[PDB]
Amino acid sequence: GFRDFLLKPELLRAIVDCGFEHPSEVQHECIPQAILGMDVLCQAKSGMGKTAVFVLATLQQLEPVTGQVSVLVMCHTRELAFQISKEYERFSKYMPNVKVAVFFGGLSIKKDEEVLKKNCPHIVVGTPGRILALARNKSLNLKHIKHFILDECDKMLEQLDMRRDVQEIFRMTPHEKQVMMFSATLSKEIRPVCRKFMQDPMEIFVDDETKLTLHGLQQYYVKLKDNEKNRKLFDLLDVLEFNQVVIFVKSVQRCIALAQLLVEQNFPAIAIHRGMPQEERLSRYQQFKDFQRRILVATNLFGRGMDIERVNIAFNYDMPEDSDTYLHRVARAGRFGTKGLAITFVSDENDAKILNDVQDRFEVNISELPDEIDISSYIEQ
Structure with missing residues (x-):
């Protein structure tokens, strides 16, 4: 202490x-x-x-x-x-x-x-x-x-x-x-x-951060136009079971808007973006840990990977810059949980090239989202 x-x-x-x-x-x-x-x-x-x-x-x-x-x-x-x-x-x-x-x-x-x-x-x-x-x-x-x-x-x-x-x-x-x-x-x-x-x-x-792994995670992607994202996201939210979910977007504007939309749609969400005082970013991420709300919309967090054990799904609503950011977004580094579901949205050829870039770096295949996903595969019970 x-x-x-x-x-x-x-x-x-x-x-x-x-x-x-x-x-x-x-x-x-x-x-x-x-x-x-x-x-x-x-x-x-x-x-x-x-x-x-x-x-x-x-x-x-x-x-x-x-x-x-x-x-x-x-x-x-x-x-x-x-x-x-x-x-x-x-x-x-x-x-x-x-x-x-x-x-x-x-x-x-x-x-x-x-x-x-x-x-x-x-x-x-x-x-x-x-x-x-x-x-x-x-x-x-x-x-x-x-x-x-x-x-x-x-x-x-x-x-x-x-x-x-x-x-x-x-x-x-x-x-x-x-x-x-x-x-x-x-x-x-x-x-x-x-x-x-x-x-x-x-x-x-000091020994650099103990790197994260994608080992044990369920990973998929969905190819869709940008104006098709909200519908797809919401439909998936209606079908996939989860305790908490994290959604990553590319900008503050997108983060604020998406979070507002979820909130309006009775999806209590919290926004944490690069346009907030660190004290506020920290206080909000703490509120989320306290399982105050089920959805976190963010531009990026504090690295170290997903540390909230109630988070069962991570959505790259907007494709991550590089493979390295994909890893910091998706990997779990909590106190117990090792299973998790990662879903990425692909709107153009550039996001796809980046997704393929990710599949190679960590030597993992990221299939197209199937019609059926077994809950026991991404949630621990």
Whole structure:
């Protein structure tokens, strides 16, 4: 549990508010020594509560000083910087004085400067390019940094030009501070950067997610036009027995609409799409687990495969991007159940090519949906 991490009361309070009740492995491996202020080099092949590692660790040690930035987190992806910032917000909910800001390209630097002069945050998240510019401009004062965090290091340090910028930013910070570096993979020349940034760091390599399998699943597909999907879906819902069902679609617009239609048709459904605050996405997926409703319509979830044991059928209402997403959508990784029914809709030659692509990758044949499906084959009793 997160209580064993011996974190500040208000920090544990926010943790309970978010949802997750069990720490991931990268968290058991890193958090303890990270809150002790130890330098850390962590290769985690994922995002499985990985950002929460440095967000909780830095918040735990944070000694807020008004108008002073004590924590700097930089990553390669603009979107990841954005999400890391929202995560700091969520976890510092019971630390009313804590301020966070995220800076990245795409937005006039004048806006960033305005924030730094008028209401400087204690924590800054950003992409190297913008962070370096604000620091050169002297808008961002990095002379008080006590925690220097880098994520997506492999991508961030891939090229000399960006590696040079990060080292330049690094030199503007105090020599005495905690440094943590996270990355999905350990590229070649990142070791040299690590040697310059950290000395004798605790090195943690977390065993990538235990991959999923299609073993034991019933898999089929149906060739139909797009405007024939709703009828087919609903007819199948009327015939196939299930406790709960998950339906995957390609967009937010499709997700919201399909879910609304089901709800109107007395098919209590819940929508979870890429256009919701993570806190909302998490809270909704939790509601679904609580078997609050029988149908979940979604653009994608939190990987790790199907973990809700009451879900008996997964519909790819819209064909999945690649085979890899098919696997993350269909595979079961719950506490007991291994049987399940997967049904894919094929509207054009492109979805078909992708479906054939899936049949080869995992060496499984996906037949056309038959008129009769034995319930005992996809539901455990």
